[PDB]
């Protein structure tokens, strides 16, 4: 069915309206490139009564972008289809470009991927000021690129340098104010209303101030230089390069390559270079695991896919914080960025009043980077009241546990505090390992307690894994999670189990690279194997963050939990390497050496006598070998997460260990990784089964994939 209705006034200026009938939002389908060519033509028939364009929205929004829908079941065999289907996008835009009359749109709020290409494909961009309203190219966040003339007009526009840093690269998104100032948004209005009239207006104007060149594109005109002059140079660009290599995510180096090879050549040529490499992404498995995570998964779960279905909002008012330290002062904060008063306690007046100190330190370097503004500084700190008195904490209606990590302990500080509280009053444990239905044994009113795991750093950290015990009640879950929605972070809902799931998890992570280390890997290569397969952090860095003498207890707690129930235990060859690491004194970043050494709180070098204590060498196992040995560890500990009903939906399993736990984000989670596994020997769940088989030949049966995988 159509999506553009055609207006046309007395003076001439057709107004092209985008009403897609099919949703709230106008997308890239294939009933929109069905009605934009039927428009164009109509526009080309047309030509001696038509002076000029306007292309408008109907909806909240302009324009969303592409139809993930579509894009997200092209096969490799489909790409030469896909590129046909972008050209013809391109080719209603360039006519539309080169009527010879001027085209104006009117933004009228969030544009997006493809609706900022509609938008660039004019010559006069007129935007709202309206609240909400975003504009940009964010397909690169899912492996794509703006396959609709996004990079060749972008590049026109600014050169190389500036339309690759700014709005390719990174896929900003930007508010009207600053996408006028960097050049892509011609002229700002006050509201919606007077979006139409400026641009007939605009276009009057123009009809007798440029009379020659309106219609004319800087770029199409007689003596055009592009900006920074036409051109692998990735030394000019910032240091956030490791982006342009290209190995583990294909989308940032295409686009470079896309934009350099279209300035050496004219606009027609430029696009069809567009073209090719949009069809060589778009029919990628990086693509679709980028498509299923960071568009079909976020958005599953911002709907509320974890919570429950029939609860309503219970408003909070107050805020309690049982301990300050790394996390405890990072919660307080993040609280206090909203409106919610917040209530701090510890065991001494000044420890509590140390750890909002620490929550005025980033406040201090927000105001010297001018984040905020000072009175708003002031009321954020209004909000903090640090106390050692448990009468303050009466009236608090959601509570946040922050001590020591000790059992008995955590029943004594909810035993002072669940009798002055509300009765209504959320009694939630930030505990890294120990079982949520263990700790609510404490409590009187154990249907309210409730486990919230954040990370450090609070600030930093966008997720939150929820954890339920066997006597957590519903509707305290989902005012859990909407207090996560309010503090800008990520919610995911676990089952209460040994270990959850982000701890679990991760620890196979960095016992396999432990593993290594003990069979006798050169210390550099696991790091090498680790930063090619994508972590953020290597994983002997990151086992340096996480305490070893903490990661003792894990392994403790593990085992005598398989003796109590009559069986012999088997021990991960990690365990070995830890201990050997605390005989020797080095326990990690916060000891002041481990696998790193460390001074004056920054990380030094690897341990020069490590390869000595480990016999570094005398192993030498393929480099992609020892990539898939710790991604499959996770993914293969993921799915025994689902088996077990540590989690519940394999959204939740992959935005929890993309923002969680570091999992490489071109894989799109570790229960993606399952699906959208590829190999030299094929592609999908078969193929991660047979690769799962051939690492548990060689390494061990920790590899052996389950039964839920087989059939
Ligand atoms: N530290 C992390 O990065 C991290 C990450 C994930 C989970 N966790 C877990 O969540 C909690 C986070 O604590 P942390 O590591 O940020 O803090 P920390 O261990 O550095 O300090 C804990 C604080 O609790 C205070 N405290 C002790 N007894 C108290 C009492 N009776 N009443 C009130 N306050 C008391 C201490 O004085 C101290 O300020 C711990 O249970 C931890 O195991 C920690």
């Given at each position: 069915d ?5 207006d ?9 309206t ?14 929109y ?10 526009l080309?028939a047309?030509?001696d ?5 306007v292309?408008?929205?109907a ?7 592409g139809?993930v829908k579509?894009?997200i079941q092209?096969?490799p ?8 289907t ?14 010879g ?9 969030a544009?997006?991927?493809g609706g ?7 010559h006069?961009?007129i935007?709202?000021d309206?609240?909400?309203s975003?504009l ?6 899912l492996?794509?690129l703006?396959?609709?003339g ?5 590049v ?6 500036n ?6 690269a ?6 009207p104010a600053?996408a ?8 700002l209005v ?8 400026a ?16 219609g004319?594109?800087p ?5 055009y ?5 036409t ?10 390069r490791k982006?342009?290599?290209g190995?583990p995510?294909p989308?940032?180096?295409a686009?470079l ?7 050496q050549?004219?606009?027609?040529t430029?696009?069809?270079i567009?073209?090719?490499?949009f069809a060589?992404?778009v ?7 980028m498509?299923?995570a960071?568009?079909?998964d ?7 896919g974890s ?9 909070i ?13 990072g919660?307080?904060?993040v609280?206090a960025?909203?409106?919610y008063?917040?209530?701090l ?11 909002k ?5 980033l406040?201090?370097?927000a105001?010297?980077?001018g ?9 954020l ?10 009468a ?8 946040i ?6 059992q008995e302990?955590?029943?004594?500080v909810?035993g002072?505090i669940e009798?002055?509280?509300e009765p209504?009053?959320?009694l939630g ?5 120990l079982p ?5 044994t ?7 307690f ?8 609070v ?7 929820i954890?339920?015990?066997?006597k957590t009640?519903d ?15 990520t919610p ?11 701890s679990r998890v991760?620890g ?7 593993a ?7 210390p550099?290569?696991?790091e ?6 994508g972590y953020?952090?290597?994983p002997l860095?990151?086992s ?6 903490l ?5 403790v ?8 129930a ?6 991960h ?5 830890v201990?050997?690491?605390?005989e020797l004194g080095?326990s ?9 050494e ?6 030094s070098?690897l ?7 480990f ?19 996770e ?11 540590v989690?519940?939906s394999?959204?939740?399993?992959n ?6 736990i570091?999992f490489?984000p ?8 399952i ?7 094929g592609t ?5 089964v047979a ?12 590899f052996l994939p ?6």
């Open positions: 159509n999506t553009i209705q055609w046309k006034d007395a003076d001439g200026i057709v107004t092209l985008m009403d897609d009938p099919s949703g709230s939002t106008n997308v890239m389908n294939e009933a490139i069905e009605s934009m060519g039927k428009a164009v033509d109509r080309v047309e030509k009564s038509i002076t000029g364009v292309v408008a929205s909806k909240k929004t302009f324009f969303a972008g139809d579509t894009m092209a096969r065999e489909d790409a030469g289809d896909v590129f046909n972008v050209e013809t996008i391109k080719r209603q835009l360039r006519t539309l470009e080169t009527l009359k001027p085209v104006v749109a009117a933004i009228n709020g544009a997006l991927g900022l290409e509609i938008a660039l494909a004019c006069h961009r935007a709202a309206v609240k909400g975003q940009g190219l964010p397909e690169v966040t492996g794509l703006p396959g609709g996004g990079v060749t007009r972008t026109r526009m600014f050169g190389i340098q339309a690759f840093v700014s709005v390719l990174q896929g900003t998104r930007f508010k600053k006028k100032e960097i050049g892509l948004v011609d002229e006050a509201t919606v209303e007077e979006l139409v009239p641009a007939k207006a605009w276009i009057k104007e123009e009809l007798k101030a440029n009379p020659d060149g309106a004319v594109q770029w199409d005109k007689k003596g230089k592009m900006p920074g002059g051109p692998i140079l990735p030394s000019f660009p910032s240091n956030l982006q342009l290599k190995a995510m989308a940032p180096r686009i390559a896309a934009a350099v090879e279209g300035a050549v004219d606009f027609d430029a696009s069809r567009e073209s090719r490499y060589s992404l029919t990628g498995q990086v693509a679709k695991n498509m299923q960071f568009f079909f976020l958005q599953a779960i911002n709907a509320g919570r429950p279905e029939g609860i309503g909002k219970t408003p008012k107050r805020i309690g914080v049982l301990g300050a330290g790394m996390m405890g002062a919660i307080a904060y609280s960025k909203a409106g008063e917040v209530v306690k510890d065991v001494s007046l000044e420890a509590a009043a140390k750890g100190g620490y929550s005025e330190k406040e201090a370097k105001l010297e980077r984040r905020t503004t000072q009175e708003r500084s002031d009321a700190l209004a909000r903090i009241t640090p106390t050692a008195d448990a303050d904490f009466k009236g608090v209606d959601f509570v546990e922050a001590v020591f990590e000790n302990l955590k029943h004594k909810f002072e009798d002055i509280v209504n009053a959320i444990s930030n505990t890294s390992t949520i239905t263990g700790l609510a404490g409590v009187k009113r154990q249907e309210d409730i486990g919230i795991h954040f990370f450090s750093p600030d930093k950290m966008p997720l939150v894994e954890i339920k015990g066997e009640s509707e305290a879950l989902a005012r859990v999670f909407d207090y996560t929605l309010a503090i800008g972070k995911i809902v676990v089952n209460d189990s040994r270990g959850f799931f982000t991760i196979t992570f960095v016992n396999e690279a432990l290594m280390l003990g069979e006798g890997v050169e550099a290569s696991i090498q194997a680790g930063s090619q397969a953020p952090a290597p860095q990151l340096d963050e996480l305490n070893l003498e990661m003792h207890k894990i392994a707690a593990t085992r005598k939990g398989v003796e109590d009559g069986g012999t235990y088997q021990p060859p990690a365990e070995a390497v201990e050997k690491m605390i080095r990690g970043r916060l000891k002041g050496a481990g696998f790193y460390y001074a004056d709180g920054k990380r070098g341990w020069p006598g490590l390869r000595e204590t016999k570094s060498g005398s192993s030498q196992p393929p480099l992609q070998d020892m990539i898939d040995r710790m991604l499959f560890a993914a293969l500990e993921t799915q025994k997460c689902l088996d077990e009903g989690l519940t394999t959204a939740d399993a935005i929890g260990s993309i923002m969680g570091g490489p071109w894989t799109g989670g570790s229960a993606q990784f699906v959208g596994y590829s190999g030299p020997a999908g769940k078969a193929a991660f690769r799962a088989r051939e690492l548990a030949a060689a390494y061990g049966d920790r389950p039964e839920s995988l087989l059939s």
